[PDB]
Structure 1
Amino acid sequence: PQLPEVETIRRTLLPLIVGKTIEDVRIFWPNIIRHPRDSEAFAARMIGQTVRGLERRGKFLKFLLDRDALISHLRMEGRYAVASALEPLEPHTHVVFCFTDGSELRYRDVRKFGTMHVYAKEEADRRPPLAELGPEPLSPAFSPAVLAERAVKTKRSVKALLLDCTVVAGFGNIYVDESLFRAGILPGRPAASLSSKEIERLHEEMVATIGEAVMHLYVYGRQGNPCKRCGTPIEKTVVAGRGTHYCPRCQR
């Protein structure tokens, strides 16, 4: 899921779990659990805690309990569902939180790529994976100035820069390619080569792209197809070890 999907999950999941008390935690793929390392300690500490809130940072979901926060990342195919303990689990269900009212929060993930960390609330923000996470793209903490500051200090491509989680939180491949197209910037441009005007434009399109999504595509996955703005076939190469889509005419 992308940041906008994660925000949707945050919004819709919360009322389904708030105020419920955890009675059991069942884990079928231990490797999902990253902290505490021992998945049995993970399970034991959450029992008896009540869900008090649900926040998002980047693509991370932060479940607030009584004493702890559960930090969860779905990666590409992780999904949460709330349902009855009386019904069979869906395929690829790896973690289940059982509540005292007979309902469950289920985590499914065909790729088994997602991660979970639990810490005392007051520690969550200064421990992995939230530590070092950059500002929310939709927040004033993410500004042209901040972006400019990071751009000049590096020799990497502009795409690599925007993919950097310390620069800005949860900006995925798709939104990077779309935003660069919209800003008229080639993804392979060295970040330091960007003018001040290009930085402001990029910031503006980044916010617009992610902002519109939280509420179609120009280039992502459209290789071999005409650009919607100029008709030139969209091209695909590899930049920053990633599938990279761009229009060689609109972007410079």
Structure 2
Amino acid sequence: PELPEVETIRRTLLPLIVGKTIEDVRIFWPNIIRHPRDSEAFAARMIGQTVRGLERRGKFLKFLLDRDALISHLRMEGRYAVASALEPLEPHTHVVFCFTDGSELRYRDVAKFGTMHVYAKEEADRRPPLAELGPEPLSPAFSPAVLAERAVKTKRSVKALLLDCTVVAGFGNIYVDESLFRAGILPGRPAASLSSKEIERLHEEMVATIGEAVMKHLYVYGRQGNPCKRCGTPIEKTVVAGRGTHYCPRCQR
């Protein structure tokens, strides 16, 4: 999922688990557990803790417990559901947190690409995978000034810049392509080549792109060969920053 869908998972999952106490943690694919590296230590430390909250940083979910935080990344196929311990698990269920009320938080992931890290809450933000993560795109911490500073200092492409998770949290191939289209900026443009006006432009469209999706329709992503929705020019697809990049050669400069 992208940032907006992760926010939806966060918002909807929370009431379904808040105040529940973990009685057991069952792990069927230990490779998903990245910290502690020993999945048995992972399971043992969580037993007895109560879920107190659920936050999101970038595309990471942060489950807040009594002492620990559980940092979870769904990657492509990761999904959480809450269900009764009396019912058969669904396929590709790799981790299950059993609560004292007979309900379970189940983690499914056909790809097995998702990750889980557990640390004392006060440490989570300075350890992998959260350490270094850039500001939230919808927060005042992410500002034109911040973007300009990273842009001027680098030599790489504007697309590469926006894909950098230290620059801003949760911008993937898709939202980068769309934001650049709406700001009228070619993705292969050197970040340093952008004018102040262009920076403000890009920042404003990045926020609008993420923001509209979080609250509530693509221009370029995947649409190569189709007419641009603003000028009718065929959308193109190339490689920029070792990525498949979608753009309109007329709207974007």
Q: Is TM more than 0.5 here?
A: yes
State the shift of 1:44 in Å.
0.4
Runs of 4+ in 1 over 3 A off after TM superposition: none
**The residue matched to 2:246 in structure 1 has which SS?**
strand
Residues in 2 aligned to 1:55 and 1:127: alpha-carbon distance in whole angstroms? 16
CA shift at 1:172, angstroms? 1.1
Length, aligned pairs only:
252
Distance 2:89 2:177 in 1: 37
For 2:5, what is the secondary structure of its paired residue? helix
Q: Secondary structure in 2 aligned to 1:34? A: strand
* Aligned-pair CA distance for 1:111: 1.2
Residues 110-121 of structure 1: pairs in structure 2 closer than 5 A = 110-121=110-121
CA-to-aligned-CA distance 1:60-80 (integer Å, 9 cap, x gap): 100000000000000111111
Secondary structure, counterpart of 1:210 in structure 2: helix
Q: Deviations over 1:101-144 (max 9, x none)?
A: 11111111111111100000111111111111100000000000
Instruction: Tell me, in whole angstroms, the C-alpha distance in 1 between the residues paired with 2:41 and 2:155.
Output: 43
Distance 2:160 2:97 in 1: 37
Q: Distance in 2 between matches of 1:178 and 1:34?
A: 33
**Cα distance, 1:86 vs structure 2:** 1.1
- Which ranges in structure 2 are unaligned for 5 or more consecutive residues? none
1:1-252 residue pairs with structure 2 within 5 A? Answer: 1-215=1-215, 216-252=217-253
Q: What secondary structure is seen at the aligned counterpart in 2 of 1:37?
A: coil
Paired-residue identity, % = 99
108-117 or 140-149, which deviates more: 108-117
CA RMSD of aligned residues (A): 0.6
**Distance in 1, Cα, partners of 2:245 & 2:86:** 45
Q: For the residues of structure 2 that align with 1:80 and 1:233, how far apart are their CA atoms?
A: 39
Instruction: Show CA shifts across 1:31-72 (max 9, x none).
Output: 111100001100000000000000011111000000000000
